[PDB]
Amino acid sequence: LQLTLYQYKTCPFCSKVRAFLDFHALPYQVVEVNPVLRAEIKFSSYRKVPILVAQEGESSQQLNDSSVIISALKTYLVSGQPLEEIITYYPAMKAVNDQGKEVTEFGNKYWLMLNEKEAQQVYSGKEARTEEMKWRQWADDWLVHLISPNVYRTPTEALASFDYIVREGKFGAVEGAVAKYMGAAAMYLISKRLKSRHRLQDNVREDLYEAADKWVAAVGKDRPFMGGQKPNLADLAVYGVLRVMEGLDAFDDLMQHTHIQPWYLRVERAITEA
Amino acid sequence: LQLTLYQYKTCPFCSKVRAFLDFHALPYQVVEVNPVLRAEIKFSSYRKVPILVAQEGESSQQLNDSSVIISALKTYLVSGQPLEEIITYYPAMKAVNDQGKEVTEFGNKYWLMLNEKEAQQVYSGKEARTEEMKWRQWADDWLVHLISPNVYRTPTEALASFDYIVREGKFGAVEGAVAKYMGAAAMYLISKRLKSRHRLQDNVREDLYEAADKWVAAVGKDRPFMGGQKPNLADLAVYGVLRVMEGLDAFDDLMQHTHIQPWYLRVERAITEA
Numbered sequence: 001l002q003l004t005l006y007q008y009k010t011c012p013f014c015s016k017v018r019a020f021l022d023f024h025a026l027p028y029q030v031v032e033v034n035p036v037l038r039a040e041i042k043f044s045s046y047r048k049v050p051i052l053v054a055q056e057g058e059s060s061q062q063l064n065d066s067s068v069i070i071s072a073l074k075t076y077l078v079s080g081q082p083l084e085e086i087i088t089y090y091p092a093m094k095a096v097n098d099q100g101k102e103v104t105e106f107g108n109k110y111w112l113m114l115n116e117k118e119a120q121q122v123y124s125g126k127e128a129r130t131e132e133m134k135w136r137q138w139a140d141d142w143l144v145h146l147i148s149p150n151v152y153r154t155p156t157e158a159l160a161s162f163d164y165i166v167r168e169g170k171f172g173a174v175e176g177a178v179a180k181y182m183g184a185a186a187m188y189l190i191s192k193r194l195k196s197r198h199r200l201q202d203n204v205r206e207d208l209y210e211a212a213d214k215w216v217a218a219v220g221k222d223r224p225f226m227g228g229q230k231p232n233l234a235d236l237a238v239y240g241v242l243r244v245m246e247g248l249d250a251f252d253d254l255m256q257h258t259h260i261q262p263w264y265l266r267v268e269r270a271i272t273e274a
Numbered sequence: 275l276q277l278t279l280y281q282y283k284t285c286p287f288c289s290k291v292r293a294f295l296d297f298h299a300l301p302y303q304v305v306e307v308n309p310v311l312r313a314e315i316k317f318s319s320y321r322k323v324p325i326l327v328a329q330e331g332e333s334s335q336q337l338n339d340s341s342v343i344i345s346a347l348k349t350y351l352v353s354g355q356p357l358e359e360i361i362t363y364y365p366a367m368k369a370v371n372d373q374g375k376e377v378t379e380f381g382n383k384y385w386l387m388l389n390e391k392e393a394q395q396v397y398s399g400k401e402a403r404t405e406e407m408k409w410r411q412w413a414d415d416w417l418v419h420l421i422s423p424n425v426y427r428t429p430t431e432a433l434a435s436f437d438y439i440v441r442e443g444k445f446g447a448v449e450g451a452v453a454k455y456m457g458a459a460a461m462y463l464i465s466k467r468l469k470s471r472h473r474l475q476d477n478v479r480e481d482l483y484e485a486a487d488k489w490v491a492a493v494g495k496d497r498p499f500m501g502g503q504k505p506n507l508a509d510l511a512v513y514g515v516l517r518v519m520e521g522l523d524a525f526d527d528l529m530q531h532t533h534i535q536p537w538y539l540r541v542e543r544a545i546t547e548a
């Protein structure tokens with residue numbers, strides 16, 4: 001089973017898949033996609049990243065959605081059922097938006113296709129299973145929306161963010177320089193609207209701290225991770241979404257004003273502990 | 275187990291739930307909602323219909339999404355697991371649209387929460403289970419979109435449709451008269467755009483026939499219903515969506531130019547056969 005992960009290193013969706021693969025010590029190769037030309041992903045009809053293709057000898061499968069990849073690869077690690085069958089339980093559901101745009105959502109993306117036996121093996125109980133599902137959805141439907149407005153909240157921050165994005169990502173020496181200044185500007189302004197459209201406060205930092213606190217309270221103090229002893233897909237989902245800001249002011253503030261570090265560091269070492 | 279179904283009689287979403295309850299000969303009461311004031315539904319935070327509340331003695335549960343109601347009530351009929359636990363597997367997933375609107379989708383809405391045993395009891399095999407799921411989604415993501423443009427396609431048709439909607443539904447003698455002419459007009463124009471936004475052909479009837487044919491070919495000629503011997507959630511989904519046009523020109527045309535009647539009539543008697 002050879003895993004190749006096509007990604008945008010600094011993207012919360014790719015970090016999410018990495019947090020999962022790393023935690024389960026799964027071996028994979030990563031091909032960094034060029035956000036401007038995206039030639040490395042032009043083999044797929046699915047036009048979003050991450051994309052993960054699993055090769056099993058002569059056979060191979062393309063897992064598209066970041067939440068679907070984790071769900072499919074996970075039910076696979078527990079059930080051992082063929083990946084080509086498992087990916088069949090998370091179908092791409094096409095529909096035309098109320099604006100005429102063709103959206104594609106993936107069915108059952110936060111549900112592991114597990115039987116009673118294996119389910120009892122990975123979950124605390126029925127309520128633990130539906131809880132991570134709810135928090136998996138929160139991570140990318142609410143939490144990720146707090147990244148941009150926060151890392152591009154100030155012109156200085158916007159430049160630091162794109163410096164890190166271009167340095168961390170794949171850009172030609174030329175488009176790198178352009179994207180560094182041009183992209184920081186566009187994103188600084190563009191995020192001013194993302195902040196509004198998503199109904200964020202004026203002090204976006206406060207929206208970040210609230211979510212952070214809302215999370216640690218959810219984890220509670222009776223357990224190290226929402227998953228209990230070890231982190232579960234929900235712990236790894238929030239971790240993966242937040243790690244993306246590591247090194248930026250947003251992250252330092254997060255750690256300094258929220259009491260989220262203990263859990264964060266906990267999920268980190270649980271990962272480095274392969 | 276007392277079932278109360280709040281609905282809009284002539285709506286495909288309510289017809290879908292009725293087609294299911296009827297087919298399983300489930301006893302329920304229906305309270306017709308006034309589309310204008312909707313007072314009869316103002317007990318629910320969920321602001322869409324159908325809504326189905328199941329009362330079990332002193333306890334009661336509100337099942338909101340038309341596909342979720344069918345999925346939950348169904349897994350319940352097979353597993354016997356408490357409804358209050360079952361509805362827990364189809365969570366409301368909130369998110370803010372790219373336009374700033376708060377949309378709510380229901381997780382795993384087309385997946386019955388069944389174990390190996392019961393699943394083998396209700397499905398032909400693994401491929402039969404994911405096939406109805408795919409056709410359940412088609413019914414409401416593609417098929418329903420062909421109803422309005424087709425039944426409001428012409429001014430004469432628009433009036434006949436609203437005559438039937440007001441006669442079939444719950445409107446005050448006054449607002450009924452208004453809605454009959456005012457609503458027919460609004461819908462005739464409004465559907466002119468629905469036809470465009472949804473990328474429908476100019477001859478919307480053709481879109482209807484194609485879908486119809488696409489369905490009968492899917493069912494094939496080796497089985498009476500997509501579900502084999504008896505109809506399954508996919509057969510009942512398409513039937514429920516189409517019945518809504520019964521009596522209108524659109525429906526007569528459908529039956530006359532598509533070879534869909536045989537299956538349609540087959541699902542009808544399978545239902546009347548309680």
Ligand SMILES: COc1ccc2c(c1)c(CC(=O)O)c(C)n2C(=O)c1ccc(Cl)cc1
Nearest residue numbers: 008010011012013035147148151161169244
């Ligand atoms: C190279 O491509 C990127 C990089 C970062 C991205 C995205 C795409 C998308 C979009 C997508 O997945 O296509 C989101 C939401 N990103 C961020 O959250 C983000 C993270 C850290 C910093 Cl410093 C600044 C921004």
Ligand SMILES: COc1ccc2c(c1)c(CC(=O)O)c(C)n2C(=O)c1ccc(Cl)cc1
Nearest residue numbers: 282284285286287309421422425435443518
């Ligand atoms: C009273 O309320 C109604 C009635 C009909 C409706 C809807 C709501 C919705 C919307 C909803 O569920 O809120 C859709 C999509 N309807 C139709 O398909 C339709 C069916 C038959 C005819 Cl003749 C004309 C139109």
Ligand SMILES: [Cl-]
Nearest residue numbers: 037038047048
């Ligand atoms: Cl593209």
Ligand SMILES: [Cl-]
Nearest residue numbers: 153154155156
């Ligand atoms: Cl500023």
